[PDB]
Design a protein around this ligand. Structure first.
Ligand code: ADP
Ligand code: MG
Ligand code: NA
Length: 222
């Protein structure tokens, strides 16, 4: 029932987010290629495994990869530099590669089996990443009539994701690349000096400024 919050690594981003990404919610990060969507996903997959006084939820991670951008050595790096054992961190991340959008849909069903298994253990799943939420959908549904059909399949997939978030008290974190019904939309862009800037889109309950952070050996951080 009460909502959990997963620190991103960046104090600035966390404040913008109201303390971190929420369980019982789908948080969508969207932005151009190279903006940092996948790096934020990597960092979150580590942060969630921290205890709560360090901004985590003692959680396991399920990661649905659609573009083969998951890097286990990046996870090990981030974990090591934040004082976690990198091999242990990796063992609590369950990555599956989605071959196409239908298999991506099926993987969400399978995620429920893994979630149920871990639920009342000491490392329940607390984060479900889809990176990228839309890349297969953009690629497969194209041409006259595909707008309605793509949106319908995507809405179904997002409904499935929202049910897991709410039913199991999990944060869902999804990426979308920009040249549907997410709970919170975060616009990410690359700024001057290598900085990254985040802004919330249509989110009255949180701050209306922008967060600024860097991508480092610790993942993201101010
Ligand atoms: N270890 C690192 N330290 C600093 N910047 C990094 C590191 N690793 C990757 N990056 C930067 O992250 C950016 C890519 O982020 P990425 O999450 O893949 O973008 P997206 O998923 O939004 O296309 C690149 O600019 C790259 O230089
Ligand atoms: Mg990416
Ligand atoms: Na919490």
């Amino acid at each position: 029932a009460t909502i959990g919050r997963i620190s991103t690594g960046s104090k600035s981003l966390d404040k913008l987010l109201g303390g971190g990404i929420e369980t019982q919610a789908i948080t969508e990060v969207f932005g151009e290629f190279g903006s940092g969507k996948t790096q934020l996903a990597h960092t979150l997959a580590v942060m969630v495994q921290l205890p709560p006084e360090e901004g985590g939820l003692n959680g396991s991670v399920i990661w649905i990869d659609t573009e083969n951008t998951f890097r286990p050595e990046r996870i090990r790096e981030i974990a090591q530099n934040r004082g976690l054992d990198p091999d242990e961190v990796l063992k609590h991340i369950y990555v599956a590669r989605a071959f196409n959008s239908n298999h991506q849909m099926l993987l969400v069903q399978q995620a429920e089996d893994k979630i149920k298994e871990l639920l009342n253990t000491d490392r329940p799943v607390k984060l479900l990443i889809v990176d990228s939420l839309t890349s297969h959908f953009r690629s497969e549904y194209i041409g006259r009539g595909a707008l309605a059909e793509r949106q319908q399949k995507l809405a179904k997939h997002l409904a499935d994701l929202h049910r897991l978030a709410n039913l199991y008290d999990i944060a869902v974190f999804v990426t979308n690349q920009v040249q549907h019904s997410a709970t919170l939309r975060v616009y990410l862009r690359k700024g001057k000096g290598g900085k990254r800037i985040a802004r919330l889109i249509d989110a009255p309950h949180l701050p209306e400024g922008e967060a600024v952070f860097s991508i480092t050996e610790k993942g993201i951080e101010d």
